[PDB]
Design a protein around this ligand. Structure first.
Ligand code: ANP
Ligand code: ANP
Ligand code: MG
Ligand code: MG
Ligand code: ZN
Lengths: 304, 227, 703
C-alpha cells in the first residue's frame, strides 16, 4: 500500500517501513541518551528507483523533509551561522535535519555533501544533536531525526565484483551510522523492463489495501507503543550478535565493514520497530528473527 | 571609570598596573532611578621611573661587579633548567642596544629582535611569560589571537563625535618595551606582513580614513614558534 | 494586641488582605514559626543550619523551598504566588528578626535580609507568558543574552531643597518612575531638586535579557525574550551564556515608546527577580549541607573509593576501564600552582580518546557534559578558532568594539568537550594551544590588547586515519595530529573494536541489559549514585587542595628518562616536562579523589601506571611485548606487596608463641607503620595470610 508504484524490492520496502515505525528512544541512568531512530541508506545506479523510495516516503509522512546532498542555502543538512543586517550580528540558519526534527529526513545525492555538513552529520546521526560554537552563538541544537539516504556508486554502475565499501565513497564512520544498507542494481531483464513500463503506464492511466490516511493514523497510533524486551528475545539478540561478530571475524583481515556495537543496537531497534508495527507489548523472538534477517542480508550484500 | 585631578593627570598611562585610592561616587550628570558611578581619584600608586639614591647605588654596584652578565643570565627565568645561551640572548634583548640618529637624520634601531623556533614543550612560552613580567614595558600576545590592526594600530569611528580616531595596537602599547608574540607561526601571512615597518623602522605609518600619521613603535619583538 | 485568625477566608482581594495589619501580623508570626520549627525528613532543624551557614559567610540572603513551605504552612503557599511582593516583604522582616534572634550582633553585618523562593512549581515557558500571569510569581528558564553592569539605583532618596539647606525626607524609589518631592515642606519652593548623594541610600541594580534556549523550541524560529531586573545580592548571579532558571514577579508598566511603536495602549513588561538558579550547576559547594559533607567524608574512608569512582563514570558503558580511570583523573583534576610567584603551571588534565567507530567515545563526552558543572560541548566543523577562544564584535547598542567570551573562556573552570577532533580545520584546531598549556587566551584585535583566563580541561575524541585503527602502526603514524597538539594532551587513550567472542558476548549482554533496564516504563565494585558523585566531585574540587612534599624523585626521573629513550625509537611523544607534570597532576588528582590533603606513594604509583599504560598502548602491536616487559619489571607496576607482611606476621606470631610457651593485630600494624608498607588492607584481602590460617576482626583485634 505504501509503495504501489515500486516494482519488486520487497526487502527495501520492508526496511523503510520499519524506518517509519522506528525504535524506542531511551535515557540512561546518567542522563545520556540512547538512539531510537534507525537510519537507512539506498545505494543504486541513477537509472533505478532509489529516488522513488524517498519521494514516496516524503509524500506519505507528515513533518518529513526532502533535500539534496548539496545545499540550496547557506545552511545545509546542518545549521550554519549567518549575519543579519537588522543587527549586523550572527545567528543560526537551520538546516534540513533540524527542520526534520522528530521526523524523517530524505537525503538524495547523499554522496555529494560539503565538508561542513559531512562532518556535522557524524554528531547528528548518532547523538541526535548539532553543537555549533562560533562567533556570537553557542548552541546544541536538536536533530532527533531518522535519515533515509540515497547514494550513487562511483562510476554510476554498481559493480558487484567490488564490495559496497569500494562502490561508494562514504567513510567507515559514516557507514557505521546506518542501521540498514540496501542495493538497487539496474538489471537488463526484458520482463523486468516490461513490468516497469507497464506499472508506470497503467498507474498513469488509472489516476483520474489501505489508504494513506489510514496508514498515517495507524502509524501515529502505533508509534505510541514502547515495546519491552522479553528475556528470551534478549538471549536471541545476544546470540545472533555474537554469531554476527564471529562471522565477521572470519574475514576481518580483508577490507570489510568491521561490525561494531552500533549494529547490535540497530538489531535491537529493528526488533522494536517490528513489535511497534504489530502493536505488541514486548519484543518477541520472531521479531528478533525478522530484524536479524534484514540486518544479516544487509551485511552479506555489503560485503559481497 | 576614574576621575584624576590636577597633579594626578598623566601620572599613569595605558598598560600600567595601579592601586587607586579614591571616592566611589555617582556621576551626577535601561531604567528610571539609576545613576552612573565612578571613582574620584585622590591617590595613585603604580604597583609595577624616579629612582632613589640608595637604589642608584645598588644599581651601580650591580653594574660594577665583574660577573653581572652571568648573574643576570641566571636571574632570567630561574625556574627554567638549561637554555643558558637563550637566557643570555634574552638578557641582551631586555637591555637592548643604543638608538642612534646620524647626521643626515636617519635613525638606527637599538632594539633586538629574537625568534625562538624549535620543538614543543621546551619552555619557549614560559620564557615569553617571564619576559612580559620582567621587562619595564611588556606586552604578551598570541600570534593566532592577533590581527594586523590589533598589532600595529586600529582606525575606528569615535561613537560620541563621529570622527575617526587612532587606537594603539600591541606594538604601540609596548613602545619602549618588549612584544612577546607567542605561537608566532600561527599568524596569517598578511598579519605577519603588518609588523615589517615596526620591527625595523620602529614606526607605524598609517593612511586610512583621512587621518595620516607615523606612530612610534620603538620596541623589541620576542617571538616563539614551532617547526 | 492584634488577634490571631484563620487566614484563608476573607472578603478582600489577596493583596488588600495581606496588606491589612491583622493578617500581616499573623503571616509574620506564621513564617517566623515555620523558620524556627521546620525539620528535615531525618529531623534536622533545616533553617537553623541554613541561617548559620548564611551568617558564617555573611551572605545576607536566605533561600526557602516552596515544596516544604507548602508542607508546613498552607495559606502562606496559597498567598505567595498571588501577592508575592507583599508576602515577600513580610517574609523578609520575619526572617530578619529570626536571624537577629540566632545571631544578635548580625545587624552590624546587614540591616536587611531577602527571602529567595526556590523550586516554585508553577513553571512557565518563556513564550507562554500572558496577561494572566501579571503581578504573579512565575518561574522561567532561558539563556542570558545581555547584561548591564552592576549600577547603583536609588532606593531611599533625600532631596536637598533647590534654594536652601533643608533635606526633604526619604522617598521610596520605584521601578516605574523617578519619585519626586514636588515642593519643600519647610518653604514651598518647587520643581527641580538636588539629590543628597551622601545620605541617599542606593541599591545594586542589574538588568539582564534572557531568551529561550536555542535547543528548547527554536527549531528555525526566532526565540522570544524577556527583560529581568536583579536587585541587591542577586546581581552577578549570572553572566551572558548562562542557562539560568529564573523566579520572579511578572510586572508591567506603561511605556509611551511601545505605545507609539504599536499604535495601541501596549504596556511593557519586566521580571522582578526573586531567585536565580542554573540548569547546568545543579549542585554547588555553597549549597552543600553538613549531611552531604558527612556522607562524602564517610565514603572517602572506604579503601575501594578509587574503584567505586572509576566504576561510577558512565556506568552504562561496558569495559573501557582505562578510559574511565583517565576521565576520572581529568574530572577531578590536579592542583594549579605558581612556585616563586613568577612561574605558572596548570593543574588541569587534558585527555584525548582516539579510536575506531562504535566505541562510545562521543558517548563518554556526552556523559562528561552531563555530570560536570560549567561543561560545554562542540564538534569538528561546528567549532571555529574565534568561537573556541574569543570574538571581537561591534557592541549592539554602543557600536564600539568589545571582546566576548569563546568556548574555552566560558569553560574557564570547567570542561570543554571537543568531539570528532580529527575532523576540525587546522586553523580552528591550532587556536587552543595557548589555552591548553598557558591557560590564557591572548587577544590583540581592533584596539583590544588583553589576555583572558582559560583554566579549562580539554577532553577530546577523534578517529585515526581512514576511520579504523590499525595495530600495525604507532599512534603518531595513524592519528594525523602533530607533536605540539599531541603533547598538550596529558592522557592519550586508544580504543579498538577488535573481535573476541567471549568479550563480545559480555559486551552485548551488557548492552541489551542496559536497553531493557533503561526502558521508559569489568565493574565488580558497584558505582556511586550519580547525584552522590556530583556532590563528591564538587566537594573535592573546592574543599581539598592536595599538597606535594615527597614523590620519590629519583624513581620518577629514571622512569621519565628511559621513557624518553624508548620513545625516541618509536611513535609517541613525551615532550620533556609536560609528561613529568602530567604525572604530578595525575598524582594530585588521585589524592583529590581520595580527599587527601597530601600526595602519597600510592597516588604516584597510579600516575606512573596511567602514563606507562597509555604509552604502551601507542606502540605497534609487535612492539608491545618488549615495551611492556621493559617498563613492567623495573618501572614500578607495583601490584601488591603481600610477602613482606606475611613474613612480618609470621615472625611476630613466632616470637609471641615462643614467649607464651616459655593484641597481635596491634603488634602487626606497629611493624607495618614502622616499615614503609602502610597500606595493610591489601594483606587482609589477600589469600597469603589466609592459607597460613590467619584472620582478622576489627572488634577483637586477634589474628
Ligand atoms: N627546561 C625546562 N625547565 C623547566 N620547565 C620546562 C622546561 N622545558 C619545558 N618546561 C615546562 O614545560 C611546560 C610547557 O612549556 P612551554 O613554555 O609551553 O614550552 P613551549 O616550547 O613554548 N611549548 P610549545 O608552545 O608547544 O612550543 C611548562 O610547564 C614549562 O615550565
Ligand atoms: N562498551 C560499550 N557499552 C555500551 N554502549 C556502547 C559501547 N561501545 C559502544 N556503545 C554504543 O555505541 C553507540 C555509539 O557511541 P559513540 O560515542 O557515537 O561511538 P563513537 O566512539 O563516537 N564512534 P565514532 O563517532 O564513529 O568515532 C552508542 O549508542 C554507545 O552506547
Ligand atoms: Mg607556545
Ligand atoms: Mg564519535
Ligand atoms: Zn528652601
Amino acid at each position: 500500500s505504501l509503495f504501489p508504484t515500486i516494482h519488486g524490492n520487497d526487502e527495501v520496502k520492508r526496511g523503510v517501513l520499519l524506518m517509519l515505525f522506528g525504535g524506542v528512544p531511551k535515557t540512561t541512568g546518567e542522563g545520556t541518551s540512547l538512539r531510537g531512530d534507525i537510519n537507512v541508506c539506498i545505494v543504486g545506479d541513477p537509472s533505478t528507483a532509489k529516488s522513488q523510495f524517498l519521494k514516496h516516503v516524503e509524500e506519505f509522512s507528515p513533518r518529513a523533509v526532502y533535500t539534496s546532498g548539496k545545499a540550496s542555502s547557506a545552511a545545509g543538512l546542518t545549521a550554519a551561522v549567518v549575519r543579519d543586517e537588522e543587527s549586523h550580528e550572527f545567528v543560526i540558519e537551520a538546516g534540513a535535519l533540524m527542520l526534520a526534527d522528530n521526523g524523517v529526513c530524505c537525503i538524495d545525492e547523499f554522496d555529494k555533501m560539503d565538508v561542513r555538513d559531512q562532518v556535522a552529520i557524524h554528531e547528528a546521526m548518532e547523538q541526535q544533536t548539532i553543537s555549533i560554537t562560533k562567533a556570537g552563538v553557542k548552541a546544541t541544537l536538536n536533530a532527533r531525526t531518522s535519515i533515509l539516504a540515497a547514494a550513487n556508486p562511483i562510476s554510476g554502475h554498481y559493480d558487484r565484483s567490488k564490495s559496497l565499501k569500494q562502490n561508494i565513497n562514504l567513510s567507515a564512520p559514516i557507514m557505521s551510522r546506518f542501521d540498514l544498507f540496501f542495493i538497487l542494481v539496474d538489471e537488463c531483464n526484458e520482463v523486468t523492463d516490461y513490468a516497469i513500463a507497464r506499472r508506470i503506464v497503467d498507474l498513469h492511466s488509472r489516476i483520474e489495501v489501505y489508504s494513506l490516511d489510514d496508514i498515517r493514523r495507524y502509524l501515529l497510533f502505533a508509534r505510541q507503543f514502547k515495546p519491552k524486551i522479553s528475556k528470551e528475545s534478549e538471549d536471541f539478540i545476544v546470540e545472533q550478535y555474537k554469531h554476527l561478530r564471529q562471522r565477521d571475524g572470519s574475514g576481518v583481515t580483508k577490507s570489510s565493514w568491521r561490525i561494531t556495537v552500533r549494529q547490535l543496537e540497530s538489531m535491537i531497534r529493528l526488533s522494536e520497530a517490528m513489535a511497534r508495527m504489530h502493536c505488541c507489548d514486548e519484543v518477541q523472538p520472531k521479531h528478533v528473527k525478522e530484524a536479524f534477517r534484514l540486518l544479516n542480508k544487509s551485511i552479506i550484500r555489503v560485503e559481497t | 571609570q576614574l576621575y584624576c585631578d590636577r597633579y594626578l593627570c598623566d601620572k599613569v598611562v595605558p598598560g600600567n598596573r595601579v592601586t587607586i585610592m579614591g571616592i566611589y561616587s555617582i556621576k551626577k550628570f535601561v531604567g528610571v532611578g539609576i545613576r552612573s558611578s565612578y571613582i574620584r581619584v585622590l591617590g595613585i600608586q603604580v604597583d609595577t621611573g624616579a629612582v632613589s639614591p640608595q637604589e642608584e647605588e645598588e644599581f651601580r654596584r650591580l653594574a660594577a661587579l665583574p660577573n653581572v652578565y652571568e648573574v643576570i643570565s641566571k636571574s632570567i627565568a630561574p625556574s627554567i633548567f638549561g637554555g643558558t645561551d637563550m637566557k643570555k640572548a634574552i638578557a641582551c634583548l631586555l637591555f637592548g642596544g643604543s638608538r642612534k640618529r646620524l647626521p643626515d637624520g636617519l635613525t638606527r634601531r637599538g632594539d633586538i629582535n629574537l625568534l625562538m623556533l624549535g620543538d614543543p614543550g621546551t619552555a619557549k612560552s614560559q620564557l615569553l611569560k617571564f619576559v612580559e613580567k620582567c621587562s619595564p614595558i611588556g606586552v604578551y600576545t598570541s600570534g593566532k589571537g592577533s590581527s594586523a590592526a590589533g598589532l600595529t594600530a586600529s582606525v575606528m569611528r569615535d561613537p560620541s563625535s563621529r570622527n575617526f580616531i587612532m587606537e594603539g595596537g600591541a606594538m604601540v602599547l609596548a613602545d619602549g618595551g618588549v612584544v612577546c608574540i607567542d605561537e608566532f607561526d600561527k599568524m596569517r601571512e598578511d598579519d605577519r606582513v603588518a609588523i615589517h615597518e615596526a620591527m625595523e623602522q620602529q614606526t607605524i605609518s598609517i593612511a586610512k580614513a583621512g587621518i595620516t600619521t607615523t606612530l612610534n613603535s620603538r620596541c623589541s619583538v620576542l617571538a616563539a614558534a614551532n617547526s | 494586641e492584634s488577634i490571631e485568625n484563620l487566614e484563608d477566608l476573607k472578603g478582600h482581594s489577596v493583596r488588600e488582605w495581606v496588606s491589612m495589619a491583622g493578617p500581616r501580623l499573623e503571616i509574620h508570626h506564621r513564617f517566623k514559626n515555620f523558620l524556627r520549627t521546620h525539620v528535615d525528613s531525618h529531623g534536622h532543624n533545616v533553617f537553623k543550619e541554613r541561617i548559620s551557614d548564611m551568617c558564617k559567610e555573611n551572605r545576607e540572603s536566605l533561600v526557602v523551598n516552596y515544596e516544604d513551605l507548602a508542607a508546613r504552612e498552607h495559606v502562606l503557599a496559597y498567598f505567595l504566588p498571588e501577592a508575592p511582593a507583599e508576602l515577600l516583604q513580610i517574609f523578609d522582616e520575619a526572617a530578619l528578626e529570626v536571624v537577629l534572634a540566632m545571631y544578635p550582633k548580625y545587624d552590624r553585618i546587614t540591616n536587611h535580609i531577602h527571602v529567595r523562593i526556590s523550586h516554585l512549581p508553577l513553571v512557565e515557558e518563556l513564550r507562554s507568558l500572558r496577561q494572566l500571569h501579571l503581578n504573579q510569581l512565575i518561574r522561567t528558564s532561558g539563556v542570558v543574552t545581555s547584561c548591564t553592569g552592576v549600577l547603583p539605583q536609588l532606593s531611599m532618596v533625600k532631596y536637598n531643597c533647590n534654594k536652601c539647606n533643608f533635606v526633604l525626607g526619604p522617598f521610596c524609589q520605584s521601578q516605574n518612575q523617578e519619585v519626586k518631592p514636588g515642593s519643600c515642606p519647610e518653604c514651598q519652593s518647587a520643581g527641580p531638586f538636588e539629590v543628597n548623594m551622601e545620605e541617599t541610600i542606593y541599591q545594586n541594580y542589574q538588568r539582564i535579557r534572557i531568551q529561550e534556549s536555542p535547543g528548547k523550541v527554536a527549531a528555525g524560529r526566532l526565540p522570544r525574550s524577556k527583560d529581568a531586573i536583579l536587585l541587591a545580592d542577586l546581581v552577578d548571579s549570572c553572566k551572558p551564556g548562562d542557562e539560568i532558571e529564573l523566579t520572579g514577579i511578572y510586572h508591567n508598566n506603561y511605556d509611551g515608546s511601545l505605545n507609539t511603536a504599536n499604535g495601541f495602549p501596549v504596556f511593557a513588561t519586566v521580571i522582578l527577580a526573586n531567585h536565580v538558579a542554573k540548569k547546568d550547576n545543579k549542585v554547588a559547594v555553597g549549597e552543600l549541607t553538613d549531611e552531604d559533607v558527612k556522607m562524602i567524608t564517610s565514603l572517602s574512608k572506604d579503601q575501594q573509593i578509587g574503584e567505586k569512582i572509576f566504576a561510577s563514570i558512565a556506568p552504562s558503558i561496558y569495559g573501557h576501564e582505562d578510559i574511565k580511570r583517565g576521565l576520572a583523573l581529568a574530572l577531578f583534576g590536579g592542583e594549579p600552582k605558581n612556585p616563586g610567584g613568577k612561574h605558572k603551571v596548570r593543574g588541569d588534565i587534558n585527555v584525548l580518546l582516539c579510536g575506531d567507530p562504535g566505541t562510545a567515545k562521543s558517548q563518554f563526552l556526552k556523559y562528561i557534559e552531563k555530570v560536570s558543572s560549567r561543561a560545554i560541548f562542540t564538534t569538528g566543523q561546528g567549532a571555529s578558532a574565534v568561537g573556541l577562544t574569543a570574538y571581537v564584535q561591534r557592541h549592539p547598542v554602543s557600536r564600539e568594539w568589545t571582546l566576548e567570551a569563546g568556548a574555552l573562556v566560558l569553560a574557564d573552570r570547567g570542561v570543554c568537550l571537543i568531539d570528532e577532533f580529527d575532523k576540525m580545520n587546522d586553523q580552528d584546531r591550532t587556536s587552543i594551544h595557548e589555552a591548553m598549556e598557558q591557560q590564557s587566551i591572548s587577544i590583540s584585535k581592533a584596539g583590544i590588547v588583553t589576555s583572558l583566563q582559560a583554566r579549562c580541561t580539554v577532553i577530546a575524541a577523534a578517529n585515526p586515519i581512514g576511520g579504523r585503527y590499525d595495530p600495525s602502526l604507532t599512534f603518531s603514524e595513524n592519528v594525523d595530529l602533530t607533536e605540539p597538539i599531541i603533547s598538550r594532551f596529558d592522557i592519550l587513550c586508544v580504543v579498538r573494536d577488535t573481535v573476541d567472542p567471549v568479550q563480545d558476548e559480555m559486551l552485548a549482554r551488557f548492552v541489551v541489559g542496559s536497553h531493557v533496564r533503561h526502558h521508559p516504563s569489568t565493574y565488580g565494585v558497584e558505582p556511586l549514585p550519580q547525584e552522590v558523585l556530583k556532590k563528591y566531585i564538587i566537594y573535592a574540587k573546592e574543599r581539598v587542595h592536595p599538597k606535594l612534599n615527597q614523590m620519590d624523585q629519583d624513581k620518577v626521573a629514571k622512569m621519565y628518562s628511559d621513557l624518553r629513550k624508548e620513545s625516541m625509537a618509536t611513535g609517541s611523544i613525551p615532550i620533556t616536562v609536560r609528561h613529568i607534570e602530567s604525572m604530578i597532576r595525575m598524582a594530585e588528582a588521585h589524592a583529590r579523589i581520595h580527599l587527601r590533603d597530601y600526595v602519597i606513594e600510592d597516588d604516584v604509583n597510579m600516575a606512573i601506571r596511567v602514563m606507562l599504560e597509555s604509552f604502551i598502548d601507542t606502540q605497534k602491536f609487535s612492539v608491545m611485548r618488549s615495551m611492556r616487559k621493559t617498563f613492567a619489571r623495573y618501572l614500578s607496576f607495583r601490584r601488591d606487596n603481600n610477602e613482606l607482611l606475611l613474613f612480618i606476621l609470621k615472625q611476630l606470631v613466632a616470637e609471641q608463641v615462643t614467649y607464651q610457651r616459655n593484641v597481635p593485630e596491634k603488634d602487626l600494624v606497629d611493624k607495618a607503620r614502622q616499615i614503609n608498607i602502610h597500606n595493610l588492607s591489601a594483606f587482609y584481602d589477600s589469600e597469603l595470610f589466609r592459607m597460613n590460617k590467619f584472620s582478622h576482626d576489627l572488634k577483637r583485634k586477634m589474628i
